[PDB]
Amino acid sequence: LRAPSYCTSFNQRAQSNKTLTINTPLTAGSQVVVALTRPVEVIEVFDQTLVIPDPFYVTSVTRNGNSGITLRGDDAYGAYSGLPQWAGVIMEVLAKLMTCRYAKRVRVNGSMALPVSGVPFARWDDGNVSVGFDGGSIIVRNASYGGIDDVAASVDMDLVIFNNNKPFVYDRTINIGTSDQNIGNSLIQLSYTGALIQNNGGYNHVRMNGIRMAGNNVRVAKNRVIGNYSRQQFQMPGKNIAVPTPLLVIPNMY
């Protein structure tokens, strides 16, 4: 168990190409913890009278020597430049504390705005749904459906929100992927885990990625539809991206 201290929270675009620098005071000998709430951003790029969807996701996090952090990312195809918008919360293991200001088992029917602003954690049990988070709302979709329609779904979950009443304490971090990983009896952070480009129904079908929790195992699943671009104009290679940024896991003591 760890008790990180709140430092700041950012929601802004990168200053330079795929690089977002956030300045904040830091102390020597401290483990900086960054909880990305918006690690992905599908930017439309212009290439010679073509408007092309292109996910931009964070790749690595670097500490700027006791003065801040920087986030460096990349696009799906490694060919286009842009300024993506990323959000998160910067903390420090070594002085305000985030407090549990919301804890309720809720019923989310397709979408639900957060009752109180903060960093949401949740756990549920359903294999046919996926849960995402765009910053203000929780998005629940039908992940077992193969098509270009934005088919919603419902799920019962335990929702906990921390903002800056028990202190925020976490025990492990997890890198989500295409294979199941058991998190035990614990709550996982809610966010988009990547983006998908697919050849589906004569379109370049673009979706976001969410979290699938069946039992206690978590992996990546398809989520909210971003857009459909006709393949009569241009055709894109298929992409399925899971971000390398870790997600926080907190004990189920809230």
């Binding site: 010679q48 009278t49 073509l50 104009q233 241009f234 055709q235």
Partner: protein, 147 residues
């Protein structure tokens, strides 16, 4: 070598042009080509009947796939434009001529408004190359005419 400056057959310096679509893109190209060569074009209803007549026939344009990528997607196209025509020498018989133009290009993904401007330029250039071929076949008609 024994080169020397070259010295349309002189019997076709005045001729009638019939196309069925005199305001079309092919006939406009042909008239321009029979203007740089000092040929006077007479109206279709000339009282004179001792002049040859060039009658433009059917024109066919075919575009097909020439290459594919490793996913089977179309890489290159090939367009073939065929033009038919006949020249009538009064007293003599009918001498058909034809042209065949080839053009290869890559299938470039573009917005369809920008992409048909590129296709409308390729076809316009293939009309000028087809008109030039029909003028180079006039000396061979005069040779056939003189059995």
């Amino acid at each position: 070598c024994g080169w020397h400056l070259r010295d349309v057959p002189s019997t076709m310096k005045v001729m009638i042009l019939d196309s069925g679509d005199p305001n079309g893109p092919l006939s406009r190209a042909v008239r321009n080509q029979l203007r740089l060569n000092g040929v006077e074009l007479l109206d279709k209803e000339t009282t004179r009947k001792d002049v040859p007549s060039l009658r433009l026939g059917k024109v066919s344009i075919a575009k097909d796939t020439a290459s594919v990528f490793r996913n089977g997607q179309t890489a290159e196209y090939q367009m073939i434009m065929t033009v038919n025509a006949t020249v009538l020498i009064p007293g003599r018989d009918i001498y058909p001529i034809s042209a065949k133009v080839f053009r290869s290009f890559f299938d470039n993904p573009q917005m369809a408004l920008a992409k048909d401007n590129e296709q409308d330029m390729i076809v316009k250039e293939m009309y000028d190359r087809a008109a030039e071929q029909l003028i180079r076949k006039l000396p061979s008609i005069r040779a056939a005419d003189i059995r």
